[PDB]
Amino acid sequence: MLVKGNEILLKAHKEGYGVGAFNFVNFEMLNAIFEAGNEENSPLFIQASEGAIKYMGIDMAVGMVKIMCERYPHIPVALHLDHGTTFESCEKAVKAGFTSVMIDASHHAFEENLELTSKVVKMAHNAGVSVEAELGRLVNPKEAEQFVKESQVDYLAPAIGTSHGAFKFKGEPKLDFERLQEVKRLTNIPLVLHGASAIPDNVRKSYLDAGGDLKGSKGVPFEFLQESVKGGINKVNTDTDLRIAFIAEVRKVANEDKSQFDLRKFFSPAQLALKNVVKERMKLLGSANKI
Amino acid sequence: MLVKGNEILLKAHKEGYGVGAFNFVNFEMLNAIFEAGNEENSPLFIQASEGAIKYMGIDMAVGMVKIMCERYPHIPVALHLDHGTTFESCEKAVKAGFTSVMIDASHHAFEENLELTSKVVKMAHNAGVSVEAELGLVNPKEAEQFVKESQVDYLAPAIGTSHGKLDFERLQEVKRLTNIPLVLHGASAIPDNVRKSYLDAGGDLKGSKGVPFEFLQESVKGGINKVNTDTDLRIAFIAEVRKVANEDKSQFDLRKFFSPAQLALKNVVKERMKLLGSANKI
Numbered sequence: 001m002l003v004k005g006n007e008i009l010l011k012a013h014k015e016g017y018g019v020g021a022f023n024f025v026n027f028e029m030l031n032a033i034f035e036a037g038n039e040e041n042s043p044l045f046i047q048a049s050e051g052a053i054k055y056m057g058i059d060m061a062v063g064m065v066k067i068m069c070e071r072y073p074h075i076p077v078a079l080h081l082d083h084g085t086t087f088e089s090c091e092k093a094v095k096a097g098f099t100s101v102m103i104d105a106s107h108h109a110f111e112e113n114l115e116l117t118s119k120v121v122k123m124a125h126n127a128g129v130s131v132e133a134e135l136g137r138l139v140n141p142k143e144a145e146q147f148v149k150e151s152q153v154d155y156l157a158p159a160i161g162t163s164h165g166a167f168k169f170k171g172e173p174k175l176d177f178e179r180l181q182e183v184k185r186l187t188n189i190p191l192v193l194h195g196a197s198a199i200p201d202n203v204r205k206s207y208l209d210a211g212g213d214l215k216g217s218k219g220v221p222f223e224f225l226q227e228s229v230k231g232g233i234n235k236v237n238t239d240t241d242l243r244i245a246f247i248a249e250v251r252k253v254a255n256e257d258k259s260q261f262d263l264r265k266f267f268s269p270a271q272l273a274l275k276n277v278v279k280e281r282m283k284l285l286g287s288a289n290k291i
Numbered sequence: 292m293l294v295k296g297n298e299i300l301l302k303a304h305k306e307g308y309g310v311g312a313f314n315f316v317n318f319e320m321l322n323a324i325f326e327a328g329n330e331e332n333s334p335l336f337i338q339a340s341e342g343a344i345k346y347m348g349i350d351m352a353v354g355m356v357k358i359m360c361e362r363y364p365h366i367p368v369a370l371h372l373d374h375g376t377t378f379e380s381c382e383k384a385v386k387a388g389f390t391s392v393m394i395d396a397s398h399h400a401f402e403e404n405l406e407l408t409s410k411v412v413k414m415a416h417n418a419g420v421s422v423e424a425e426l427g428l429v430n431p432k433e434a435e436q437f438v439k440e441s442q443v444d445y446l447a448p449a450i451g452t453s454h455g456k457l458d459f460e461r462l463q464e465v466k467r468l469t470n471i472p473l474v475l476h477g478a479s480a481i482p483d484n485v486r487k488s489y490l491d492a493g494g495d496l497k498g499s500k501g502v503p504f505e506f507l508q509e510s511v512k513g514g515i516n517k518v519n520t521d522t523d524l525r526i527a528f529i530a531e532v533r534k535v536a537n538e539d540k541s542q543f544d545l546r547k548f549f550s551p552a553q554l555a556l557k558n559v560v561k562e563r564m565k566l567l568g569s570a571n572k573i
């Protein structure tokens with residue numbers, strides 16, 4: 001059922017596994033994510049950016065998820081506001097029915113980040129909603145310790161070297177695992193890895209074969225994702241991988257049959273490829289068979 | 292809010308205009324249809340085929356429409372099962388919250404088409420749901436009898452489309468004898484700008500030629516009140532999807548594909564609402 005974010009991540013934290021947090025912007029993405037969770041017996045973090053919420057309407061974003069939760073009532077699901085930029089946005093998400101909100105004030109200085117995070121936390125906890133914040137313009141583990149203690153935030157995204165999107169590394173993949181472990185030891189709460197898409201080889205091949213361009217793309221190696229979870233990561237934000245796999249199949253259908261305009265013929269295969277990315281990621285991170 | 296199909300079509304029947312019945316398979320199609328209805332101040336018939344229901348799940352098809360109705364509470368909206376093939380299909384749609392169901396037995400002989408339609412009507416009317424049937428070109432006196440015995444709310448008579456040249460005089464006869472709202476199937480009108488968009492994007496239409504706008508106008512003048520529209524929406528939508536794919540091989544943000552696709556679909560709907568005469572009827 002639809003549950004407070006901390007309910008899923010505290011179990012992940014206690015048992016040391018990672019739960020993918022999968023973005024969606026419409027029905028097809030949402031359905032494939034849920035079918036993956038059903039097929040791998042995995043709890044689900046479903047998240048929506050402010051852009052996705054604008055695109056869908058917050059009423060549709062929450063409404064579709066509630067329909068899917070009723071369709072799969074045995075699956076623990078948290079609905080999470082990804083990269084909330086203001087108190088008011090986090091408050092709107094709470095009022096609408098989100099069960100987790102992220103407030104991203106990591107571009108502010110420490111005191112202003114902590115001040116706004118603490119304000120979001122009070123509002124959210126008053127409503128039974130868990131809260132994520134972010135530290136790292138890389139994270140300072142002693143700042144993280146104080147930040148978590150004073151804010152009462154439920155989970156923290158410490159910056160250890162990732163970034164959003166398909167172009168994460170110009171050199172060798174490198175994540176500061178010693179820093180992650182220090183943060184984990186000093187905070188002892190669930191941690192979040194942003195920018196955690198891997199761009200798997202088969203997703204890349206699918207995309208390029210359909211005529212796409214992924215020049216210079218590099219994701220987090222699978223081994224780095226697994227080492228992140230060993231280091232204490234429990235929420236693993238994933239979006240780019242889903243988009244590439246989905247749009248690869250759309251491009252393919254368009255290439256292979258110029259007369260095709262049944263939307264289902266484009267989006268059924270796209271859903272299948274996205275679903276398969278999620279199922280593999282659930283296994284990799286350790287959330288498979290955790291229901 | 293959601294209302295019975297017949298409440299929308301009774302008005303169009305009385306006042307002699309046509310209401311587009313617009314198919315959807317997902318959120319993007321549904322949002323664009325609703326925005327068009329909001330922008331043209333037009334009532335909405337929202338249609339879902341059996342294939343679309345299988346694709347979305349009936350719980351999501353109804354659920355999304357209910358959300359959209361609450362977003363635009365002033366717009367009259369009927370949720371219609373398009374080309375239901377069996378009693379059980381129509382009954383499931385009734386139970387899920389559809390406010391209109393169509394049973395297509397037009398491939399059967401008159402006697403068999405009438406008994407099945409009649410069974411669906413009993414069930415649907417018990418639940419407060421309007422019923423469409425189909426009958427084929429049609430013999431107006433058989434249509435007269437069909438409608439009186441079945442008590443169906445609206446009829447799709449075969450009157451010239453190649454489905455499942457407009458026979459205007461036949462259309463008028465059926466209208467006179469049945470005096471109920473009538474439905475036109477298989478009359479998408481691939482507008483010139485939609486055809487150009489699809490081909491400009493590398494699409495292949497070839498042979499698939501739309502029935503002209505004057506055909507739809509004449510049909511409403513003859514008594515057509517519901518105009519099923521689906522093909523035209525898909526072509527406008529996918530034209531823009533193909534276009535984005537062509538023009539940026541690095542683009543994989545779904546919203547970059549589907550926001551222009553929604554706008555193109557929405558504009559097809561707004562134009563059709565004005566063409567059929569449902570604009571400014573709220």
Ligand SMILES: O=C[C@H](O)COP(=O)(O)O
Nearest residue numbers: 023049051052082083239
């Ligand atoms: O919010 C972070 C996601 O990975 C990107 O989502 P967005 O592009 O919809 O903001």
Ligand SMILES: [Ca+2]
Nearest residue numbers: 104106107134
């Ligand atoms: Ca940030």
Ligand code: NA
Nearest residue numbers: 081082083102
């Ligand atoms: Na987040």
Ligand code: NA
Nearest residue numbers: 372373374393
């Ligand atoms: Na129909």
Ligand SMILES: [Zn+2]
Nearest residue numbers: 083164194195
């Ligand atoms: Zn982030």
Ligand SMILES: [Zn+2]
Nearest residue numbers: 425454455476
């Ligand atoms: Zn038909």
